């Protein structure tokens, strides 16, 4: 017994669906995505996430012919028992009015077969828009996406494979699928207060997606969860390509100490300390002692 969740990944052909999945779940780098083939029909992928959750990912080829089957002969197969629809939009697309009809047909099949399904819209490839225009273009599309989403709420995100914004969107999606995710946020709150950290992030070991975080004093970079996921993920891939697997990191300067370490068999942790009268030894023995306790949960 681990909760199996059906995620649909859908959008016009070439919008970046497989590209995203190959970066978050398959250890690709953005450059490598240029070699991916068009996806024929649906490509099923089973992601063991934390070992109480399996993500049944449905990467649905976006060719016109494929979509037309998804609305007709395969309607039941596609749109039944769906927890999450992630819908991808190419910001560079010429065919907006045709992109909308394909999106709205997915919403209509989702409203008939899985109404309590969670809709995410990804306004994707924002690296090809000029940076002064990005916030402008995303607000316009979000507003349109929420009107055209009829009785349903969508949550929109502006994504690129070339930065942290992809980690922001997929962190957000997976947070909504994790079982007793508030139970975990408390158990981490506990650890953080006892160990006396300024901040503690918990990460899924394979994806390096943030699943839990504790702070005290609101910090300046609200976008920092994604940036860390991205920075460390990239280093993990350099470690296996260039030497061997990453195991641990210690970073310091005169203002902070940061510890990154294996935690449960299914997670990494990052502890941040603003150096009081705490030895290194006390923090290390607390991190070890807290493994058996988080181990239980999974």
């Amino acid at each position: 017994t681990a909760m199996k969740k059906k995620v649909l990944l859908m959008g016009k052909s070439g919008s970046g669906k497989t590209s995203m999945r190959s970066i978050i779940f398959a250890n690709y780098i953005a450059r490598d995505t240029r070699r991916l083939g068009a996806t024929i029909d649906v490509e099923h992928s089973h992601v063991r996430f934390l070992g109480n959750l399996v993500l049944n990912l449905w990467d649905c080829g976006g060719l016109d012919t494929f979509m037309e089957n998804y609305f007709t002969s395969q309607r039941d197969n596609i749109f039944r028992n769906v927890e999450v629809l992630i819908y991808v939009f190419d910001v560079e697309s010429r065919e907006l009015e045709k992109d909308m009809h394909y999106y709205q047909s997915c919403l209509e099949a989702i409203l008939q077969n899985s109404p309590d399904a969670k809709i995410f819209c990804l306004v994707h490839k924002m690296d090809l828009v000029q940076e002064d225009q990005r916030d402008l273009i995303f607000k316009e599309r979000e507003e349109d996406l929420r009107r055209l989403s009829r009785p349903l709420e969508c949550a929109c995100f502006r994504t690129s494979i070339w930065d942290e914004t992809l980690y922001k969107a997929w962190s957000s999606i997976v947070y909504q699928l994790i079982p007793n995710v508030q139970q975990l946020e408390m158990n981490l709150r506990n650890f953080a207060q006892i160990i006396e950290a300024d901040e503690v992030l918990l990460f899924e070991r394979a994806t390096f997606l943030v699943i839990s975080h504790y702070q005290c004093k609101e910090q300046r970079d609200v976008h920092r969860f994604e940036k860390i996921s991205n920075i460390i993920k990239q280093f993990k891939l350099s470690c296996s390509k260039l030497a061997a697997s990453f195991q641990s990191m210690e970073v310091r300067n005169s203002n902070f100490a940061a510890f990154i370490d294996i935690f449960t068999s299914n997670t990494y942790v990052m502890v941040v300390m603003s150096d009081p009268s705490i030895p290194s030894a006390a923090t290390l023995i607390n991190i070890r002692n807290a493994r058996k306790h988080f181990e239980k949960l999974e």
Binding site: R220, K227, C239, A243, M249, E250, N253, F256
Partner: protein, 273 residues
């Protein structure tokens, strides 16, 4: 004593893309894009677009280089055969041999065959551009044999396999111990500096707006599941030591740390810092 580099090429050669990827006052190296300037300059890097036709570009190359040998005939001429990430090795090699041939063949007929042209296959989606820069900058450091002897005494006496002296902003290595350099170790060390600097930018900048990510106490230890350890220490405000050693040598961390301070004071005296 900051080495002076100039970077030159046609519109769309890749220059400011190269300036961006490498540097984004605050480098060990003084770097600028483009008979006055060429008077006090160590190195001129001519960038050619290799995805494009180079015949136009080979011409400007011969003019700007014959121009500047006239002014200062000690200046290093470095040629970045660039954007090679767009080609197959068959195409990389043929261009290399072709640019090599004609660039050198063109220099015979000006009677300037005492003017050396080093070549580099570079790309911004690649480390080649770092390797390439690391080579260019190393030729402009007169005290390079002193830095290399100091790293050698440091790693010998400290059970360390490999040590690089880095410009933290650029990820250029100005010196390494005498062991052969595996370029994968160099890349991995560069990727460590990025991880240290981007985590230091986010945490540890000061309660207020800001301060500096890198400072006298900047330190990192990375442990890899094959018991390899990577160990970074601030030397100066520009320069960081990165060491590669095994867990087993790292048991003697006290001896490494005490000896590190001899090496660091020694580096300071070299640069009269």
């Amino acid at each position: 004593s900051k080495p002076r580099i100039l970077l030159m090429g046609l519109r769309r050669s890749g220059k400011s893309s190269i300036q961006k990827v490498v540097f984004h006052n605050s480098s060990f190296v003084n770097f600028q894009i483009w008979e006055m300037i060429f008077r006090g300059t160590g190195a001129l890097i001519y960038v050619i677009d290799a995805q494009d036709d180079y015949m136009e570009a080979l011409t400007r190359l011969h003019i700007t280089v014959s121009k500047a040998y006239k002014v200062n005939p000690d200046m290093n001429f470095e040629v970045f055969i660039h954007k090679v990430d767009g080609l197959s090795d068959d195409h990389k090699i043929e261009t290399q041999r072709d640019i090599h041939q004609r660039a050198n063949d063109d220099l015979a007929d000006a009677g300037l065959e005492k003017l050396h042209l080093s070549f580099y296959l570079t790309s911004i989606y690649d480390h080649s551009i770092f390797e390439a820069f690391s080579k260019v900058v190393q030729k402009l450091i007169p005290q390079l044999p002193t830095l290399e002897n100091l790293l050698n005494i440091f790693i010998s006496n400290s059970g360390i396999e490999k040590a690089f002296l880095f410009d933290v902003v650029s990820k250029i290595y100005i010196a390494t111990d005498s062991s052969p350099v595996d370029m994968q170790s160099y890349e991995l060390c560069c990727d460590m500096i990025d991880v240290v600097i981007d985590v230091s930018c986010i945490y540890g900048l000061k309660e207020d707006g800001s301060g500096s990510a890198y400072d006298k106490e900047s330190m990192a230890i990375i442990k890899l599941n094959n018991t390899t350890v990577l160990y970074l220490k601030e030397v100066t405000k520009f320069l960081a030591l990165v060491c590669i050693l095994r867990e087993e040598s790292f048991e003697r961390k006290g001896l490494i740390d005490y000896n590190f301070h001899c090496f660091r004071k020694a580096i300071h005296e070299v640069f009269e810092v």
